Amino acid sequence: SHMTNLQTFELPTEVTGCAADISLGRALIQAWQKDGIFQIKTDSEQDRKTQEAMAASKQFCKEPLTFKSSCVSDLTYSGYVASGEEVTAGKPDFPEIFTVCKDLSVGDQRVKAGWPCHGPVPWPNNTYQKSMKTFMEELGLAGERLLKLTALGFELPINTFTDLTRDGWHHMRVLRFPPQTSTLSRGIGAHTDYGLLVIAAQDDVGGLYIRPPVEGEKRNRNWLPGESSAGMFEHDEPWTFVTPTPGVWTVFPGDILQFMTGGQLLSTPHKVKLNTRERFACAYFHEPNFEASAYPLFEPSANERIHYGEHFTNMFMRCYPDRITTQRINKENRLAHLEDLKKYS
Ligand SMILES: O=C(O)CCC(=O)C(=O)O
Numbered sequence: 482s483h484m485t486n487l488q489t490f491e492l493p494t495e496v497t498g499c500a501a502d503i504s505l506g507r508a509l510i511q512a513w514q515k516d517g518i519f520q521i522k523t524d525s526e527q528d529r530k531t532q533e534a535m536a537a538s539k540q541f542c543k544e545p546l547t548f549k550s551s552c553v554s555d556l557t558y559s560g561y562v563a564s565g566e567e568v569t570a571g572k573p574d575f576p577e578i579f580t581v582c583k584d585l586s587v588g589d590q591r592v593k594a595g596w597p598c599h600g601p602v603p604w605p606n607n608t609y610q611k612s613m614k615t616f617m618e619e620l621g622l623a624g625e626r627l628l629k630l631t632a633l634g635f636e637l638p639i640n641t642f643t644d645l646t647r648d649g650w651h652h653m654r655v656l657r658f659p660p661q662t663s664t665l666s667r668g669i670g671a672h673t674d675y676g677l678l679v680i681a682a683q684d685d686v687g688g689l690y691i692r693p694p695v696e697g698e699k700r701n702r703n704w705l706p707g708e709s710s711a712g713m714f715e716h717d718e719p720w721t722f723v724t725p726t727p728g729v730w731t732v733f734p735g736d737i738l739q740f741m742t743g744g745q746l747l748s749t750p751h752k753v754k755l756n757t758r759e760r761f762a763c764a765y766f767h768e769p770n771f772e773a774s775a776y777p778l779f780e781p782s783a784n785e786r787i788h789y790g791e792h793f794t795n796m797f798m799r800c801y802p803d804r805i806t807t808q809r810i811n812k813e814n815r816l817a818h819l820e821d822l823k824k825y826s
C-alpha cells in the first residue's frame with residue numbers, strides 16, 4: 482500500500498560530464514543514500530518495449546508447464562525456472578522465472594571453447610525473443626547513462642564503471658507471481674541482488690517492497706560467504722512499497738556497487754508480497770563483463786577483488802545445483818577456464 486513517493490529523474494540521452502551531469506549524478510547518489518531507490522522517466526520507445534515484454538511474458542506463462550519446463554539449456558543458465566525451486570533464507574519462493582543472459586550462438590568463440598554459462602537462450606517463441614532482446618538493449622542504454630552519472634557524481638572519471646561493462650554480462654529475470662492462495666503472503670524473502678546495478682519494471686498490481694538505508698543498522702556484505710543478507714530485516718520497519726507508476730523504471734544498487742563504493746552505497750534489500758492477482762515484473766541486471774573484476778574505488782591500497790565471471794558462475798551453480806547447466810559444468814570441468822581468465826585476460 483502506498484506511502485512514500487519516490488524521487489523521479491529524467492536522464493539525458495547522452496552523458497558528457499558537464500557540470501549539470503555531475504549535479505544530476507550527485508542527486509542520484511543522494512536518492513540511493515536516502516531512499517535506496519529512485520525512478521527514471523521512460524519515453525515512448527522505452528515504455529513500448531516494456532509493455533511488449535510484459536505481454537510476451539504473460540503469453541508464455543499461460544503455456545503448459547510441460548512446455549515451459551522444456552526451455553532450458555545445458556550451456557547457459559538462460560531459460561525457465563519453475564516456482565518453488567529458488568530458496569531465500571531457507572524458504573522456497575513463489576515466482577516462476579525466465580532468465581535472459583547474453584544470447585550467444587554456438588558459433589561464438591566462447592561457446593565453442595566451453596566457457597561456463599555461455600550459450601544460446603532457449604527462446605520459447607520468436608515474439609518473446611524479439612521483445613526481450615529489444616527491451617534489454619534499451620535497458621542497457623539506460624544502464625550506461627546511470628553508470629556514467631554515478632561515476633561523475635562521485636567525482637570519478639566518467640568511464641570508471643563503463644570501462645568494466647563493455648560487453649557486460651547483462652541479464653534479466655522475467656517474473657510472474659501467483660495470486661495469494663493461503664494466509665502466506667511472502668512471495669520472495671528479503672534479499673539483496675548480487676550484481677552491479679538493477680533496473681526494474683512492474684505491472685500495475687503491486688507488491689515490491691524495498692528497504693532504504695537505516696541510520697544505526699549494520700548491513701552485511703552479501704558477496705562474502707559468511708555474511709549473507711538473505712532474510713535480514715524481513716519483518717522490521719521500514720519497508721517502502723514501490724508504488725506502480727506508469728512511465729517509469731526503478732533503479733537501485735546491487736552488491737557489487739556496495740563493494741566498489743565501500744558501503745557509501747548499500748545494496749538495497751527487497752522482497753515481494755503476493756497480491757490477490759497474479760503479478761508480472763522484470764528485473765534487469767546491468768553487469769560487468771564476464772572477464773572484468775570489481776575493485777574498491779576509495780581504498781587504493783586494498784587487495785580485495787570480485788572477478789565477475791567467477792562471482793556469477795558460483796552464484797548460479799549454488800542457486801540451481803541440479804540444473805543440467807550445473808551438471809555439464811561439473812562434467813566438463815568448465816570452471817578451469819576461470820583461473821586462466823583471471824591470469825590471461
Ligand atoms: O518483482 C519485482 O518487482 C522485483 C524483482 C524480484 O522479485 C526479484 O528480486 O527477483
Ligand SMILES: [Mn+2]
Nearest residue numbers: 672673674751
Ligand atoms: Mn532480487
